Amino acid sequence: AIEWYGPDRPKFLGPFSEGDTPAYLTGEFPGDYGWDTAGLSADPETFKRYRELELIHARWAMLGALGCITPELLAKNGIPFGEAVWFKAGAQIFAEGGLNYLGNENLIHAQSIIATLAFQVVVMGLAEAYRANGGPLGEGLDPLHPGGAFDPLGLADDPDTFAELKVKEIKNGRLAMFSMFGFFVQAIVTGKGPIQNLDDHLANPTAVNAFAYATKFTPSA
Amino acid sequence: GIEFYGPNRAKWLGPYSENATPAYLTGEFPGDYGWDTAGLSADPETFKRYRELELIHARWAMLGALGCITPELLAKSGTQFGEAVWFKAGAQIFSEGGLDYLGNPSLVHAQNIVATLAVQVILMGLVEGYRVNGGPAGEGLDPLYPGESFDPLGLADDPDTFAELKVKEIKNGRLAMFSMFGFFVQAIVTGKGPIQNLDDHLSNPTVNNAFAFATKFTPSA
Amino acid sequence: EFYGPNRAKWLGPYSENATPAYLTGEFPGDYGWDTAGLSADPETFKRYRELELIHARWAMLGALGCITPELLAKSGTQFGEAVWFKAGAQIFSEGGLDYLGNPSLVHAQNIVATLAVQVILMGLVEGYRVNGGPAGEGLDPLYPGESFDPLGLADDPDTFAELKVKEIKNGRLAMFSMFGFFVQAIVTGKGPIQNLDDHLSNPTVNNAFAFATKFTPSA
Amino acid sequence: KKTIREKAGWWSNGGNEKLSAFYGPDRGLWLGPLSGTTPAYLTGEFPGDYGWDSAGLSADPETFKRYRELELIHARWAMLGALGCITPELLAKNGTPIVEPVWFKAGAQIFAEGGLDYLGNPGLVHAQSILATLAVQVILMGAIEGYRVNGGPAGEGLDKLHPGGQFFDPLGLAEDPDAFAELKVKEIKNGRLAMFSMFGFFVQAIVTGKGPLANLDEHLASPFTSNAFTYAQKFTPQ
Numbered sequence: 001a002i003e004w005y006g007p008d009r010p011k012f013l014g015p016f017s018e019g020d021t022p023a024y025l026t027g028e029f030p031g032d033y034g035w036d037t038a039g040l041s042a043d044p045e046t047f048k049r050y051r052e053l054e055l056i057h058a059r060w061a062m063l064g065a066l067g068c069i070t071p072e073l074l075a076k077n078g079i080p081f082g083e084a085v086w087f088k089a090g091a092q093i094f095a096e097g098g099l100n101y102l103g104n105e106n107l108i109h110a111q112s113i114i115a116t117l118a119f120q121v122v123v124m125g126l127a128e129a130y131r132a133n134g135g136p137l138g139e140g141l142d143p144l145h146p147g148g149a150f151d152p153l154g155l156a157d158d159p160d161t162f163a164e165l166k167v168k169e170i171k172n173g174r175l176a177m178f179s180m181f182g183f184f185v186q187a188i189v190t191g192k193g194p195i196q197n198l199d200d201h202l203a204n205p206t207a208v209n210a211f212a213y214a215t216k217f218t219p220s221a
Numbered sequence: 222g223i224e225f226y227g228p229n230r231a232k233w234l235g236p237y238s239e240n241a242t243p244a245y246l247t248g249e250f251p252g253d254y255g256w257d258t259a260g261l262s263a264d265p266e267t268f269k270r271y272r273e274l275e276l277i278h279a280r281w282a283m284l285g286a287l288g289c290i291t292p293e294l295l296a297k298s299g300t301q302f303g304e305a306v307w308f309k310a311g312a313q314i315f316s317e318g319g320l321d322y323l324g325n326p327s328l329v330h331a332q333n334i335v336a337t338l339a340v341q342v343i344l345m346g347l348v349e350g351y352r353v354n355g356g357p358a359g360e361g362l363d364p365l366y367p368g369e370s371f372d373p374l375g376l377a378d379d380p381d382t383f384a385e386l387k388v389k390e391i392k393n394g395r396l397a398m399f400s401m402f403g404f405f406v407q408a409i410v411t412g413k414g415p416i417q418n419l420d421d422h423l424s425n426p427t428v429n430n431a432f433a434f435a436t437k438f439t440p441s442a
Numbered sequence: 443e444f445y446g447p448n449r450a451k452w453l454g455p456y457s458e459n460a461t462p463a464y465l466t467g468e469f470p471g472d473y474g475w476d477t478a479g480l481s482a483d484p485e486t487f488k489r490y491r492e493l494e495l496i497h498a499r500w501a502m503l504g505a506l507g508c509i510t511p512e513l514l515a516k517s518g519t520q521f522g523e524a525v526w527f528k529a530g531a532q533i534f535s536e537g538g539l540d541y542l543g544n545p546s547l548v549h550a551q552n553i554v555a556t557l558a559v560q561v562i563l564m565g566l567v568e569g570y571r572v573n574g575g576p577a578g579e580g581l582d583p584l585y586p587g588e589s590f591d592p593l594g595l596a597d598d599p600d601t602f603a604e605l606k607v608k609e610i611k612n613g614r615l616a617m618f619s620m621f622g623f624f625v626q627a628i629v630t631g632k633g634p635i636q637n638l639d640d641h642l643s644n645p646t647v648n649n650a651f652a653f654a655t656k657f658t659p660s661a
Numbered sequence: 662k663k664t665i666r667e668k669a670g671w672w673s674n675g676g677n678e679k680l681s682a683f684y685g686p687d688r689g690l691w692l693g694p695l696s697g698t699t700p701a702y703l704t705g706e707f708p709g710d711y712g713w714d715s716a717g718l719s720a721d722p723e724t725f726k727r728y729r730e731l732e733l734i735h736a737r738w739a740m741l742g743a744l745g746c747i748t749p750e751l752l753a754k755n756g757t758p759i760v761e762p763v764w765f766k767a768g769a770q771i772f773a774e775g776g777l778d779y780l781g782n783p784g785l786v787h788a789q790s791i792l793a794t795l796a797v798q799v800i801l802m803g804a805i806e807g808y809r810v811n812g813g814p815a816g817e818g819l820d821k822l823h824p825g826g827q828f829f830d831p832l833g834l835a836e837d838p839d840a841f842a843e844l845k846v847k848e849i850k851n852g853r854l855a856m857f858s859m860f861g862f863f864v865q866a867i868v869t870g871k872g873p874l875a876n877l878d879e880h881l882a883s884p885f886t887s888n889a890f891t892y893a894q895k896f897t898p899q
């Protein structure tokens with residue numbers, strides 16, 4: 001069981017996964033568990049673009065799953081900055097003094113969403129287009145894992161643990177995408193923060209769960 | 222008569238469909254009307270996975286349409302249920318007195334939705350891992366039409382009419398899938414049961430059609 | 443010692459002819475005690491070895507599961523009912539079966555559902571003992587390995603056989619202790635560490651001979 | 662391949678796989694699919710072979726045939742017991758005036774005033790003395806149980822467990838070979854069920870002290886309060 005590659009590997013149905021795992025999923029990629037029940041990635045070009053899209057979704061979801069928990073995690077310590085939930089965090093731009101980073105007034109404290117939006121558009125278009133094509137840190141390399149200045153700490157060498165950390169990255173990333181979809185729907189249905197949902201679940205699990213909010217979206221008409 | 226296999230068969234545009242059918246839909250599979258105008262199943266393994274998805278969707282939608290029609294018909298005939306309408310039949314577990322199956326308190330009397338969901342997760346994971354791999358009701362079998370434990374009445378024998386029964390299964394399954402989508406959208410925009418909407422459309426069909434609810438989800442508010 | 447014809451035996455220095463010829467020192471704890479000849483046939487010997495080791499491990503698990511609520515009653519958590527021959531009555535109480543005296547940890551109410559879940563898990567894990575399963579497949583039915591040894595202490599075969607004889611000796615001592623718990627629960631009526639507290643209070647009166655009279659018929 | 666009426670088993674002429682599930686290696690076992698290593702001496706040629714010799718007491722074949730004898734004799738005795746334990750209670754709930762219809766107190770009926778009324782009637786048996794009853798029992802049973810092992814007036818050289826001559830198969834159900842081999846495993850399965858139920862009768866009489874049909878009615882009235890666990894506190898050591 002100590003492998004994430006080869007023909008025999010950990011799979012998404014466990015011991016129920018011999019009749020699954022078709023011929024074009026061979027375990028040659030980080031995170032192959034034989035889950036292609038829909039059959040979306042038969043073509044290896046389609047499979048390559050889906051793997052790239054999945055891994056950049058993994059990176060942005062690992063960024064997001066921590067950036068949504070840290071405002072409520074510093075509201076746990078008692079640092080007050082406007083609002084601690086993530087899905088009502090943008091409106092602090094439109095506050096009486098603007099969105100503050102850590103609440104202390106000598107910090108970022110920007111007020112106009114349109115100017116920082118334009119700055120985000122230009123530098124993120126430049127950075128992501130350098131990610132797709134190439135720029136001043138590597139022109140033609142892997143579209144998945146460039147390295148170079150992306151590994152200043154030297155974890156890209158010794159390629160077996162590079163593959164092992166690739167599987168670790170895609171596993172934590174898939175857990176982060178699952179967590180971020182759960183964050184989205186806990187924001188939609190409950191309307192409170194996810195750490196607040198954790199406090200309400202730890203305070204009373206048996207009556208306050210998702211089935212408590214099961215009758216919310218019932219169409220009355 | 223009209224056939225459903227071969228080079229000429231029943232097609233999706235009817236008589237205006239001899240140029241319309243794609244090349245890969247040669248008609249060896251049940252329910253091949255040649256409707257792949259978006260080209261989702263041009264690869265044959267994507268087509269195989271989509272056939273499995275369509276047939277399992279078809280069987281679950283047939284069960285779901287029968288279960289959406291059944292307690293409403295029994296309520297309009299004789300039987301006082303807990304909540305016979307299907308999109309409010311879930312919250313009967315929160316009716317403070319149990320979930321009576323046929324309305325009688327001598328029946329299953331369920332009060333805990335977490336245990337009900339948990340035994341459903343256990344039994345459904347077992348049965349679907351049996352469906353994709355094998356188990357006590359057949360090990361090496363067809364993943365979509367196993368037989369010899371799901372045909373105790375022997376209707377898959379004489380395979381020339383087993384092909385006709387495959388086409389009948391996929392056609393009632395596609396009609397039930399369409400009807401389940403109609404059940405969903407009718408539940409969203411009418412708030413009453415499908416049989417209550419049927420009684421409404423049978424009372425006054427000129428204004429109990431869909432266009433009376435056309436201004437309901439208006440973009441102004 | 444502990445294996446071969448020159449091993450530790452059940453009579454010791456007086457154990458050169460009473461040991462049977464078919465109890466040759468290859469199996470753990472073969473002290474040569476078959477004074478009724480019940481394991482003369484090799485299939486009887488193998489089945490009785492299986493019964494002995496399974497009874498051994500069930501007895502040591504039962505010994506710790508019986509005495510550890512008594513040691514925690516010494517430690518300070520009260521329990522639903524610390525006494526092991528009155529421990530089944532926690533689920534008959536009003537508050538239910540709290541595990542460590544915590545009402546929000548187990549809080550079991552239905553003894554019939556406890557028995558149902560217990561038999562549904564235990565029949566499966568006892569039938570998996572016979573012919574493999576998710577843990578193993580076709581190993582030694584007495585010493586499986588490879589899924590129940592996450593640390594894997596069965597590497598060196600000499601130390602493996604040493605741990606085997608240590609296990610079966612602790613197991614014979616454990617079935618001895620559980621038989622003692624059984625027959626000193628029924629004659630005293632107090633818990634076993636509580637009987638230890640009686641025997642340490644005064645060692646010459648709090649013996650088994652204080653209660654050696656109570657089972658006379660007397661019409 | 663096979664049509665619907667053959668799957669239901671309409672035709673009892675073409676049934677040759679009936680003994681395949683109770684004899685031979687492809688038979689049902691004790692833990693079902695969770696019993697892989699069948700004991701190699703329990704090859705399934707005898708009725709009731711579910712591959713169960715976990716304590717290993719029947720490895721030797723002579724001990725195995727003596728245990729088969731003991732099993733069938735205990736099976737038939739427990740079958741007669743479990744029929745003869747409930748039927749006084751069934752006929753008392755009918756309305757026939759049996760004065761102590763529970764089986765664990767029926768032996769004390771012979772110490773009453775009017776002796777042992779059989780069906781509650783003095784026109785019946787009306788046995789007074791326990792001594793002459795046990796004397797004619799030990800004489801009759803000595804004759805019968807001594808005829809059992811080495812033959813007698815109802816068969817001499819017949820089988821020690823299944824004689825089946827003109828006295829022990831008078832109706833002639835076991836004339837066919839396959840029917841006899843099927844009713845053998847039917848007999849031993851009903852006998853193991855009745856042995857288990859007679860052990861249940863013993864333990865139920867010990868820890869409850871009421872009738873088995875009274876126990877059935879007290880479980881039918883309250884299943885969840887009046888189970889075996891409400892009497893689990895009856896042997897607590899004080």
Ligand code: CHL
Nearest residue numbers: 086087088089090091092093094113116117120184187188
């Ligand atoms: C791309 C990631 C991203 C996400 C997920 C959000 C999320 C949100 N922003 Mg937002 N923003 C994001 C980027 C940015 N925002 C802003 C500036 C603001 C402002 C000023 C405000 C918001 C507000 C909001 C919230 C609207 C409340 C609502 O309608 O709840 C319903 C929605 C949910 C509960 C989440 C459901 C998830 C969604 C349906 C699926 C996610 C997939 C997306 C469709 C794809 C993302 C878009 C792509 C193309 C980039 C919403 C949760 C408002 C707010 O917080 O006040 C209430 C607000 O005032 N944002 C900037 C400029 C710096 C961004 C640039 O990166």
Ligand code: CHL
Nearest residue numbers: 214215217218308309310311312314334337338405408409
């Ligand atoms: C997967 C199929 C499935 C469907 C279609 C439904 C349907 C529903 N359940 Mg239900 N359930 C389903 C599974 C289960 N439910 C329950 C137990 C409950 C309870 C306790 C309750 C519900 C309630 C509801 C209703 C939510 C009210 C609403 O938002 O209406 C608006 C939406 C619709 C009318 C249509 C929604 C369908 C969706 C948009 C499209 C279909 C996509 C699939 C659902 C996703 C696929 C699922 C996958 C993971 C298998 C909704 C009609 C609530 C209710 O009825 O109370 C009034 C409620 O209290 N369900 C269990 C555990 C036994 C399930 C396990 O399988």
Ligand code: CHL
Nearest residue numbers: 449450451452453454455456471473475611614615618657
């Ligand atoms: C050299 C002297 C020596 C002798 C004579 C024995 C003999 C014995 N060893 Mg031992 N050993 C000896 C040295 C050694 N042994 C061992 C290794 C072992 C092991 C591993 C084991 C033994 C065991 C035994 C016992 C087995 C016989 C038995 O069960 O008792 C039968 C006789 C009695 C039970 C009589 C009891 C005395 C008293 C009369 C009881 C009171 C009766 C009640 C009042 C009546 C009950 C009343 C009613 C209500 C029922 C017995 C005490 C076994 C054991 O512990 O079994 C219990 C065992 O497992 N020996 C070693 C290491 C090499 C030794 C070193 O020299």
Ligand code: CHL
Nearest residue numbers: 560561564565566569688689690691692693694695711853
């Ligand atoms: C695959 C699942 C499966 C399981 C789990 C079992 C289980 C069993 N079958 Mg089997 N079977 C199974 C499949 C099949 N069986 C059979 C046909 C048969 C037959 C004919 C027989 C069995 C018997 C048995 C038992 C043999 C072992 C035993 O005696 O345990 C004994 C130990 C326990 C049951 C555990 C102890 C009970 C309790 C949980 C613990 C104690 C509780 C108390 C509270 C303790 C307190 C007491 C104190 C006072 C001391 C065992 C219970 C035999 C039997 O019925 O024996 C009783 C038997 O004659 N099976 C068929 C048809 C081919 C099967 C098909 O799949």
Ligand code: CLA
Nearest residue numbers: 031032033034035036040041050051053054057174177178
């Ligand atoms: C949008 C994100 C995304 C994308 C593009 C992919 C893409 C891929 N995954 Mg990954 N995966 C994801 C999210 C994603 N996955 C998440 C969140 C999990 C954890 C649950 C996994 C777990 C996972 C495993 C275990 C494996 C893959 C594999 C694969 C490959 C083949 C499967 C396929 O065709 O998927 C195509 C997927 C998409 C086109 C995304 C469609 C998104 C739709 C809208 C989701 C709809 C479902 C539902 C509405 C939302 C979730 C419901 C519920 C689960 C909460 C492919 C590269 C397999 C592989 O080959 O390894 C590399 C494999 O073994 N993935």
Ligand SMILES: CC1=C[C@H](O)CC(C)(C)[C@H]1/C=C/C(C)=C/C=C/C(C)=C/C=C/C=C(C)/C=C/C=C(C)/C=C/C1=C(C)C[C@H](O)CC1(C)C
Nearest residue numbers: 256257258259260278281282285288289307310398401402
């Ligand atoms: C062909 C083609 C071609 C081209 O190329 C492209 C395109 C266009 C894309 C395509 C198309 C497609 C389509 C049409 C789709 C659709 C689908 C559906 C509708 C499904 C359903 C599906 C559906 C389904 C399954 C359903 C199911 C159901 C169920 C189970 C139910 C259940 C229930 C009931 C009983 C009642 C209760 O009280 C509750 C509940 C729980 C609710």
Ligand SMILES: CC1=C[C@H](O)CC(C)(C)[C@H]1/C=C/C(C)=C/C=C/C(C)=C/C=C/C=C(C)/C=C/C=C(C)/C=C/C1=C(C)C[C@H](O)CC1(C)C
Nearest residue numbers: 713714715716717738739742745746764767856857859860
């Ligand atoms: C198989 C195996 C295997 C493994 O390996 C091992 C082991 C475990 C060891 C084994 C097991 C075994 C067992 C289970 C046994 C059991 C038995 C029984 C229970 C019997 C009964 C048994 C039972 C019996 C006989 C019973 C009988 C009965 C009789 C006579 C009669 C009675 C009566 C009646 C009518 C009533 C009246 O009023 C009186 C009287 C007189 C009282």
